[PDB]
Amino acid sequence: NSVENLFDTYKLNDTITLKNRILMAPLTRCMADANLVPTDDMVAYYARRAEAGLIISEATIIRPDAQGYPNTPGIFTQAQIAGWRKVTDAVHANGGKIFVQLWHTGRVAHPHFFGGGDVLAPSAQKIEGSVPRMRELTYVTPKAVTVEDIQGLVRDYAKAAENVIEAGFDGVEIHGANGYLIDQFLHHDSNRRTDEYGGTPVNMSRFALEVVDAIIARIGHDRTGLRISPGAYFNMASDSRDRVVFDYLLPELEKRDLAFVHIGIFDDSIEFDYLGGTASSYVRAHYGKTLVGVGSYSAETASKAIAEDKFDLIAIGRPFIANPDYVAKVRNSEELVAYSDEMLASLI
């Protein structure tokens, strides 16, 4: 067998060409310093994965009330910008490329992290449970954002994108997936609004598109990607009506000629009734531009999928934690170590 196609050069667009089809998926590590500034250990961590065609950074918060987990880096202070610049300089020095993933957690934020302020979301719909690996941080009922809150959020996504330029990233992946703020507007469980941001596919898509457009206005379409989750099941109850939101959203996104759309799922072998099959096949059926697949792929199954025109680029997550040298090992058909959650305790 052979995975030669994973090492094809891939021209994303006129601004960026990737040296291979392999992305490092965004992976939250919770290892930033207490001021949410990237550490020199994080610099080394990313630098040693620069053989990836493109690194997507761990989710990076746009402002304080976006924080939902400990020590997740931000990109809203000068110190954070300076810390990220060390990361991107090191990646670039190693011949790599890197996008930051811009995050707001919405109803999954927790006030413990930002001085007891309001948790924000499309609607006052609380999720079950408490923050993982933390003592007694029970999720709270969010405040339904006002249109003025929304305008500020769009502004702050845009400002974060401006900061990304100063931090030396090649671009931004907007975190529109996995039950976080943008995804909360796209799903009925979390979005029960009756104004121009709720109800209809056009309205539910409005926030996502405003953020995409605001960020494009800062860094350009060639440097802007978006991660999406048409499905549910990560802090999100399913709803049979969610699919038509994405039916509308995807062609609208295609108008923006993004660097890529990226699916956010853990196992793309799962078929979802509401999507008529796998997440990637649903998106591929409704979106005709560069698509990043992900979720329990091996190099072999990803190569096959790309050969079969199922998607164009492969993001690799857990195996990139277990194998910093993932790309070289795949290139040389060497044995890969299996991932285990225990590995998260170490930043290597």
Ligand SMILES: Cc1cc2nc3c(=O)[nH]c(=O)nc-3n(C[C@H](O)[C@H](O)[C@H](O)COP(=O)(O)O)c2cc1C
């Ligand atoms: C520890 C861990 C952290 C993750 N953090 C992020 C994240 O910050 N942003 C995101 O969009 N996805 C995140 N994911 C999802 C991964 O990007 C990826 O979609 C998932 O791990 C499936 O790919 P894989 O089977 O190759 O690991 C995380 C996954 C894991 C296991």
Ligand SMILES: [C]O[C@]1([C]OC2=[C][C]=C([O])[C]=[C]2)=[C][C]=C([O])[C]=[C]1
């Ligand atoms: C946050 O993270 C966590 C982190 O993770 C994630 C993120 C984001 C996304 O999208 C996905 C995932 C980790 C771990 C745990 O447990 C939880 C959460």
Ligand SMILES: COc1ccc(O)cc1
């Ligand atoms: C990746 O490590 C962590 C993830 C989530 C969290 O709440 C604490 C640690």
Ligand SMILES: COc1ccc(O)cc1
């Ligand atoms: C946009 O929100 C913030 C920006 C900068 C800062 O120091 C604190 C918050």
Ligand SMILES: COc1ccc(O)cc1
């Ligand atoms: C990340 O956005 C940008 C990065 C570099 C640049 O020259 C212009 C925009």
Ligand SMILES: COc1ccc(O)cc1
């Ligand atoms: C394997 O690591 C994880 C996978 C899934 C998840 O929800 C949390 C951690």
